[PDB]
Design a protein around this ligand. Structure first.
Ligand SMILES: Nc1ccn([C@@H]2O[C@H](COP(=O)(O)O)[C@@H](O)[C@H]2O)c(=O)n1
Ligand SMILES: [Mg+2]
Ligand SMILES: [Mg+2]
Ligand SMILES: [Mg+2]
Ligand SMILES: [Mg+2]
Ligand SMILES: [Mg+2]
Ligand SMILES: [Mg+2]
Ligand SMILES: [Mg+2]
Ligand SMILES: [Mg+2]
Lengths: 49, 95, 64, 110, 243, 95
RNA sequence: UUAAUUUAUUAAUGCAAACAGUAACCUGCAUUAAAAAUUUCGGUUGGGGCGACCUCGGAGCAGAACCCAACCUCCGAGCAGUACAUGCUAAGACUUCACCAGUCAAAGCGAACCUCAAUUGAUCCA
RNA sequence: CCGAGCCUGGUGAUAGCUGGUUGUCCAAGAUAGAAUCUUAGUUCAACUUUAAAUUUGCCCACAGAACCAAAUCCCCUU
RNA sequence: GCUAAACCUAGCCCCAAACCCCCACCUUACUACCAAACCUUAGCCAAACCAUUUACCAAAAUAAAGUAUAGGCGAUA
């Protein structure tokens, strides 16, 4: 998902990526109400990143 | 006095609002009755010379019933206010 | 550019204006939005109606 | 939605590949979605009924139907059953063929 | 139809439109204020939040007060915020048992009190909570002048308050002359609770008494129009003599 | 089950269901065996293990519990270290 | 009412609480009474009542896969022994015609080198 | 119109009980059982209906099913 | 061809807005004239009985959320 957002320009990798930036590029939807404490990175696509 | 507690928990209201109460909210449970706990003492300053429970100008511990029925109605003693702490210690310094 | 909403174009009562709901929910919302300004026996009829519709929608029909 | 940047070698990591300029001379056209993706989707209508939808088709949807049938006849061993929607411009295919059809539409250049 | 205003607000509308509007400002301030009493029959949570058991999470706690009931004998005396607790109780301190009515009453005494400001011995129906609050207030005069309207919770107690407050605000010859230095000692001892007379006359009244006092102020037996018109004519003739 | 509350107009959950069963996101409900920690002295070891398992529920039991809860209990939860995160989804389930 | 639950109310005690002392009445908490007050009064049944039964197992009706009623015909159980692998796991199955429950079990790890006709009981509490 | 008056309100009480439930036309459609303060009811099953996916279903004779009648079960083939 | 049958506006309903109202008469009212208010709703009803419990009514949008929580831990809240 991260690489998909970077290649389609939805996340700028030239500036720090932060919860705001992932939300603003709409890669992760966080619901604080409903007890989301944030985002965990996931090894799912680690082969080609 | 009688201190009660509610058996059932009252749901919180808002920060400005008043809670909503029901039948289960006026089922009660006594927790304590301050009528009968061991009796305390109140601090009086005795302003005459009385029997050896106190002497003139002395702050003493007196049983509540005796202090409220004898020393204060007859003016024999006064309450241990900070004001008359200062006043009677000034009197003792003058003495 | 999105500074109004057609639900703000709706002219109607306050408790159903930009809302739909069913007959019980309409009565519940009318009681809590405009209930303290209602005439006394209109409230009494509204409370009777919420009470009846509660019993009806929660205890009758098929599909229990 | 930002139009995506100009990478050097395509397909990129994660496999994105832009629509082929100039457009292919075909009887039909398939638009990318707003997120610049191929518009082939899985669908499931009971616990059972699994379909693939191609759903931004412009032009000759019956030409597309014939080409999908030609392509998917080796993969199945029959002729797939399809539901053409000339109105909404979509094609339904019975069975899950999303990865195969996506690769096929990128091959065409859509 | 609907009322323009809600029915819980009808009373404020009266207090704005009537002779209740011509009541003085500070009195209507108190009537609108109407704050909360002191805990007497319930134990307050010392904190606004509490880690409740069974899960170590802080839930907010509010302390809700018991609906206490005060009889007219209480208002004839002084009970220290203490009244009857009319409630239910479970039969054997066990909810899976009968639930059954209960009335908890206070213990009532006929005590005799001297007030140094009024110089009078009053016999009243007190309880131990009043006696203890008097001891921690260092006298009945201080208790009544310091305690708030609803913590005092007596029509009689607030009559005593405005009598004492008017005594202070006018600095009356309270015992008699030949002791003006002792009177100065009294008013100096209680000099801190000094308010204007125009406020102390309205301290402690009910709204019925306040409206009655106000209309007694504004009765004003009508002025004859003979007087009004001869005043106007004399003014006009003096204007003509000037011109 | 309270399809329409008197307060909100909303549908209510049976907290008995939430105390006893676990809803996996695919629609499977997982329970304990009724009797799994009583009279273990007189139960045989194989029956004791059969009682110790966590089991799945029937289709009509699943649909009943689906009905008896609301959709808060049917969302997808991403807890930190979860012993059922692998069980929340169905793999190779053909038909 | 000699059924269940309660004494909130009254009563007479006791204990504190509020007075007088000397070298009674009011309030709070307990108890036993009275008056009550709330509440209920299973099922099958060749009408209902009386009488008997109510769970589980073996046999016959039901002769040869499975099933198959009875206020049908008969016989039994609410455990007992032996050690305490009477461990732990896990393919695949059976199932008392539903669910709950019940039953078997290869392989694997750890080891010595169960008998049993029913032989029993859920949930919440504690 | 008294084994506990009458009136209003709660109140559209509750009713596993009775009674009733209004155009046309086609189609598919029938009596296992288990538990239940349960047999005048309900829930699960079976059956019934609809839509869906997919590949085998039904009927058979040969082989086969224990010692202490009529017939059933199983299915390779039709 | 009798009895009839036909009719349309008298008004009403739900909203919005806006806060509304000479005499006699509590004695046997409508009669010219004589020595004191303030105290928990209960229960039907749900729990397929009922005995703790059982929505709201006693001003409070949308969402949080039918969540935390309560509960013969059950109906339900
Ligand atoms: N674990 C237990 C067992 C019994 N008990 C009590 O003992 C009683 C025993 O019932 P009877 O004596 O049959 C229960 O009703 C309960 O009051 C308990 O409180 N906790
Ligand atoms: Mg809020
Ligand atoms: Mg879909
Ligand atoms: Mg019978
Ligand atoms: Mg079975
Ligand atoms: Mg009815
Ligand atoms: Mg019945
Ligand atoms: Mg037919
Ligand atoms: Mg009931």
């Amino acid at each position: 998902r991260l690489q998909y957002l970077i290649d389609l320009g939805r996340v700028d990798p030239s500036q720090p990526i932060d919860l705001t930036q992932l939300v603003n590029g709409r890669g992760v939807t966080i619901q604080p109400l409903k007890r989301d404490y944030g985002v965990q990175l996931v090894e799912e696509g680690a082969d080609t990143f | 006095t009688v201190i009660v507690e509610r058996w059932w928990k009252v749901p919180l209201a808002g920060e400005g609002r008043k809670p909503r109460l029901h039948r289960r909210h006026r089922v009660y449970k006594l927790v304590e009755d301050t009528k009968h706990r061991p009796k305390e003492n109140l601090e009086l300053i005795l302003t005459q010379s009385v029997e050896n429970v106190g002497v003139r100008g002395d702050l003493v511990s007196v049983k509540k019933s005796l202090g409220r029925n004898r020393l204060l109605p007859q003016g024999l003693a006064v309450y241990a206010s900070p004001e008359n702490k200062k006043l009677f210690e000034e009197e003792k310094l003058l003495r | 550019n999105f500074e109004k909403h057609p639900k703000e174009l709706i002219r109607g009562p306050i408790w159903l204006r930009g809302w739909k709901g069913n007959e019980l929910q309409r009565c519940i919302r009318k009681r809590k939005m405009v209930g303290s300004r209602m005439f006394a026996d209109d409230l009494h009829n509204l409370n009777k109606r919420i009470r009846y519709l509660y019993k009806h929608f929660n205890r009758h029909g098929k599909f229990r | 939605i930002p139009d995506p940047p100009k990478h050097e070698h395509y397909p990129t990591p994660s496999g994105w590949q832009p629509p082929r300029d100039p457009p292919p001379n075909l009887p039909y056209f398939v638009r990318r979605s707003r997120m610049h993706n191929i518009p082939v989707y899985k669908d499931i209508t009971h616990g059972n009924r699994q379909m693939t939808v191609i759903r931004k088709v412009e032009g000759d949807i019956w030409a597309l139907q014939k080409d999908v049938e030609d392509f998917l006849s080796p993969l199945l061993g029959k002729t797939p059953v399809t539901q053409v929607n000339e109105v909404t411009g979509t094609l339904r295919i019975k069975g899950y063929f999303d990865q195969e059809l996506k690769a096929w539409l990128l091959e065409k250049g859509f | 139809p609907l009322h323009k205003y809600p029915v819980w607000l009808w009373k404020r509308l009266q207090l704005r439109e009537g002779i209740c509007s011509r009541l003085p400002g500070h009195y209507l301030r108190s009537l609108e204020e109407e704050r909360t009493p002191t805990p007497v029959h319930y134990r307050p949570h010392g904190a606004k939040f509490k880690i409740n058991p069974k899960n170590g999470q802080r839930e907010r706690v509010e302390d809700v007060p018991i609906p206490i009931y005060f009889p007219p004998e209480s208002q004839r005396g002084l009970w220290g915020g203490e009244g009857w607790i009319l409630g239910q109780i479970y039969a054997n301190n066990d909810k899976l048992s009968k639930r059954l009515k209960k009335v908890w009453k206070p213990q009532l005494f006929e005590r005799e009190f001297y007030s140094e400001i009024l110089d009078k011995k009053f016999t009243v129906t007190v309880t131990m909570r009043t006696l203890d609050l008097i001891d921690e207030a260092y006298g009945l005069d201080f208790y009544i002048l310091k305690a708030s309207g609803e913590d005092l919770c007596s029509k009689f107690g607030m009559d005593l308050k405005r009598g004492m407050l008017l005594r202070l605000a006018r600095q009356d010859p309270q015992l008699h002359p030949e002791d003006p230095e002792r009177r100065a000692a009294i008013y100096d001892k209680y000099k801190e609770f000094a308010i204007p007379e125009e406020e102390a006359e309205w301290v402690g009244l009910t709204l019925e008494e306040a409206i009655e006092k106000q209309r007694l102020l504004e009765e004003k037996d009508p002025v004859p129009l003979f007087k009004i018109y001869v005043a106007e004519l004399i003014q006009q003739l003096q204007q003509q003599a000037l011109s | 089950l309270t399809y329409f509350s008197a307060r909100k107009g909303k549908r209510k959950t049976v907290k008995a269901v939430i105390d006893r069963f676990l809803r996996l996101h695919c629609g499977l409900w997982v329970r304990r065996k009724a009797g799994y920690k009583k009279k273990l002295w007189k139960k045989t070891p194989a029956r004791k293990k059969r009682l110790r398992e966590f089991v799945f529920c029937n289709k009509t039991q699943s649909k009943l519990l689906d009905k008896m809860t609301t959709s808060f209990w049917k969302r997808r939860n991403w807890y930190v270290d979860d012993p059922y995160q692998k069980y929340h989804d169905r793999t190779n389930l053909k038909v």
